């Protein structure tokens, strides 16, 4: 729903409530707005750029106001502060998908189906309605909440934000050199699903007995070498359904052309089956995260 | 600069200018209240915060015993809402990377003076303490209006390293291949650093004859920016970069080449380099580094 309740945001209007997370050039915090008692997450990006294009970075970030979908995280506002640029966004009380993976040892297919949908649609939104790819899809960038919503976060709307800036989710074609598009995010999403499926980052593909700690039946160049030159991870053909099996196996074909695309996936039998399934995802969330 | 205050309080600091950020750190121009001394403060926003964070500062303390005209000063370090703060000597000339932006490419005689301090600073940390730099690169070679060339961001604390982006790498071929960091690794980082400052750009995609003619035309012999894997896979498997012919002295040429031998065991060590005729020549030919630094940076100050 829409934040007409507020408007222009300055620094003072905010008050720290909690600490949400930290990343590579970014601290996020639960804060409250003065004018309207809205809990919104505040993204501090500590940076150094001339008093000239910091406006240009804010200007390019303003198209986020034009980004509205129940699968794209709500964007309240962005401004320049003495030290950092803030991005205030819809507060997702379920946090990140790896956060919830940190609690729940693995994430079940039924849920992963609901995730796949929400990402596929979210991806499609930015592509259809804004002509831009989500060049950083990963579990930490899929935000959930107690309302039962799964939403995408942290996409490169701003070209000059990108320029001014243990695991890797990047696609073969993105590492190898040229030829990179919306097929890259498919790979990203694919791996991300396989992660939450098995339980850990699956690029060293778990061995014959690795996953057995769940059921009955290292270097940075070395990593990049594996992704580029070695077979992709697969879901073990036991606990997961042939259709989920096939879904991720279609997302992790190295050749981007061979790899399935948005439409092929969105009409994949796994997605369709997931689309009509009844799952208390808001319930499963609260059963684990406790809120 | 052996300025003293010296027990540092968070609220004693005042944000003046932002200095930059990268690779897990945020450098800020700050002012100290009970001394009036403009220092640099680095925000390493480190996550985990138990007795390990307590070992980090305790390990960092050896930086008080770290004194050489070739190593950046250190006022102290403290815990401040998780994110640790290393407070260091403000180098008003900025990084060598900064001088490369304002200057064209750096003249090979000035690099000689730079080359002395990297080797000497490198050797100081190596011999007096037992740590190595793990991050030699233009942005980590700091200069000043007094004419000093110094070194920072070297790994004093083991814990801080184990506690913490590939736009363009300075890592040696053999390190990328997971054999642990040596002296020779810094040496490689120095070579590439030199070739960078000599030529005016990151050399790893090497300049083709045509491009070299646009740099210092036309004495010339032996577009897009490489992707992450593409880059490293180049650094490893492809031949090392070289200084162009007929522009820099044959001695400078052999110096940097000894620095950039892919085989780390065949690479020049600190002794070879310090006794190299390029470094010998560079010592006797006293050149006004302060005059050059200040005149190309419009920074002329009384030291
Ligand atoms: F916080 C947000 C909320 C929403 I809703 C949409 C975008 C963002 N943030 C970003 C971001 C962004 N948000 N978080 C990060 N973190 C850094 C991710 N990277 C890691 C390594 O290399 C490059 C980027 O980048 C980048 C570009 C851009 F145009 C944005 F709008
Ligand atoms: F800020 C400083 C000032 C001084 I004088 C000396 C060291 C540091 N900083 C560090 C640092 C440090 N300061 N900045 C970085 N950033 C680079 C991170 N990388 C480490 C290794 O390889 C690539 C990048 O690391 C690391 C370990 C350590 F023990 C330190 F004391
Ligand atoms: N709107 C939000 N609501 C709740 N939690 C959030 C929100 N945005 C981010 N977070 C949390 O804060 C953390 C930091 O996010 P940030 O994008 O700065 O880094 P990251 O996603 O962890 O990794 P990277 O630096 O690679 O992006 C995330 O892991 C996420 O759990
Ligand atoms: N003591 C200092 N005095 C003045 N400027 C400094 C000092 N230390 C760092 N800087 C500036 O801050 C900038 C960013 O420093 P920082 O070390 O965070 O990233 P970096 O220099 O790119 O190296 P790395 O990414 O490996 O940390 C540098 O370009 C340098 O100009
Ligand atoms: Mg993120
Ligand atoms: Mg540095």
UniProtKB/Swiss-Prot annotation, chain A:
Record PTM (Microbial infection) O-acetylserine, positions in chain: 164
Protein's cellular compartments: Cytoplasm; Membrane
Modified positions (Phosphoserine) in chain numbering: 164
Residues given in the record as ATP binding sites: 20-28, 43
Reaction equations catalysed: L-seryl-[protein] + ATP = O-phospho-L-seryl-[protein] + ADP + H(+); L-threonyl-[protein] + ATP = O-phospho-L-threonyl-[protein] + ADP + H(+); L-tyrosyl-[protein] + ATP = O-phospho-L-tyrosyl-[protein] + ADP + H(+)
Keyword field: Acetylation, ATP-binding, Cardiomyopathy, Cytoplasm, Disease variant, Ectodermal dysplasia, Intellectual disability, Kinase, Magnesium, Membrane, Metal-binding, Nucleotide-binding, Phosphoprotein, Serine/threonine-protein kinase, Transferase, Tyrosine-protein kinase
GO biological process, one term: face development
Broad class of enzyme this protein falls into: transferase
Catalytic residues identified in the record: 136 (proton acceptor)
Enzyme Commission code: 2.7.12.2
Membrane topology: Peripheral membrane protein
Post-translational modification: MAPKK is itself dependent on Ser/Thr phosphorylation for activity catalyzed by MAP kinase kinase kinases (RAF or MEKK1). Phosphorylated by MAP2K1/MEK1.
Cofactor entry: Mg(2+)
GO cellular component, one term: mitochondrion
GO molecular function annotations of the record: ATP binding; MAP kinase kinase activity; MAP-kinase scaffold activity; metal ion binding; PDZ domain binding; protein serine kinase activity; protein serine/threonine kinase activator activity; protein serine/threonine kinase activity
Domain Protein kinase intervals: 14-271
Record function comment: Catalyzes the concomitant phosphorylation of a threonine and a tyrosine residue in a Thr-Glu-Tyr sequence located in MAP kinases. Activates the ERK1 and ERK2 MAP kinases. Activates BRAF in a KSR1 or KSR2-dependent manner; by binding to KSR1 or KSR2 releases the inhibitory intramolecular interaction between KSR1 or KSR2 protein kinase and N-terminal domains which promotes KSR1 or KSR2-BRAF dimerization and BRAF activation.
Family named by the database record: Belongs to the protein kinase superfamily. STE Ser/Thr protein kinase family. MAP kinase kinase subfamily.
Medical condition linked: Cardiofaciocutaneous syndrome 4: A form of cardiofaciocutaneous syndrome, a multiple congenital anomaly disorder characterized by a distinctive facial appearance, heart defects and intellectual disability. Heart defects include pulmonic stenosis, atrial septal defects and hypertrophic cardiomyopathy. Some affected individuals present with ectodermal abnormalities such as sparse, friable hair, hyperkeratotic skin lesions and a generalized ichthyosis-like condition. Typical facial features are similar to Noonan syndrome.
Subunit composition and interactions: Interacts with MORG1. Interacts with SGK1. Interacts with KSR1. Interacts with KSR1 and BRAF; the interaction with KSR1 mediates KSR1-BRAF dimerization. Interacts with GLS.
Protein name, per record: Dual specificity mitogen-activated protein kinase kinase 2
Origin species: Homo sapiens
Gene (name only): MAP2K2
From-to range in the entire protein, with total length: 59 to 389 of 400
């Amino acid at each position: 729903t829409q934040k007409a309740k507020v408007g222009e945001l300055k620094d003072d209007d905010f008050e720290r409530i909690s600490e949400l997370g930290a990343g590579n050039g970014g601290v996020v915090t639960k804060v409250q707005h003065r004018p309207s008692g809205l809990i919104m997450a505040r993204k501090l990006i500590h940076l150094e750029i001339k008093p000239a294009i910091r406006n240009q970075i804010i200007r390019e970030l303003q198209v986020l106001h034009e980004c509205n979908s129940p699968y794209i995280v709500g964007f309240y506002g962005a401004f320049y502060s003495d030290g950092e640029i803030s991005i205030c966004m819809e507060h997702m009380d379920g946090g990140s998908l790896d956060q919830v993976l940190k609690e729940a040892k693995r994430i079940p297919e039924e849920i992963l189906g609901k995730v796949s949908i929400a990402v596929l649609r979210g991806l499609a939104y930015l592509r259809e309605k804004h002509q831009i790819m989500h060049r950083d899809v990963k579990p930490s960038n899929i935000l959930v909440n107690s309302r039962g919503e799964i939403k995408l976060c942290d996409f490169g709307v701003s070209g000059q934000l990108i320029d001014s800036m243990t695991r890797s989710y990047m696609a073969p074609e993105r590492l190898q050199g040229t030829h990179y598009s919306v097929q890259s995010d498919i790979w990203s999403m694919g791996l991300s699903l396989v992660e939450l499926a098995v339980g850990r980052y699956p690029i060293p593909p778990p061995d014959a007995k690795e996953l057995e700690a769940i059921f009955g039946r290292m270097a940075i160049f070395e990593l990049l070498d594996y992704i580029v030159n070695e077979p992709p991870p697969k879901l073990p053909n036991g606990v997961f359904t042939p259709d989920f099996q096939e879904f991720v196996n279609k997302c992790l074909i190295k050749n981007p052309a061979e790899r399935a695309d948005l439409k092929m996936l969105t009409n994949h039998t796994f997605i369709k089956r997931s689309e009509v399934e009844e799952v208390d995802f808001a319930g499963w969330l609260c059963k684990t995260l406790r809120l």
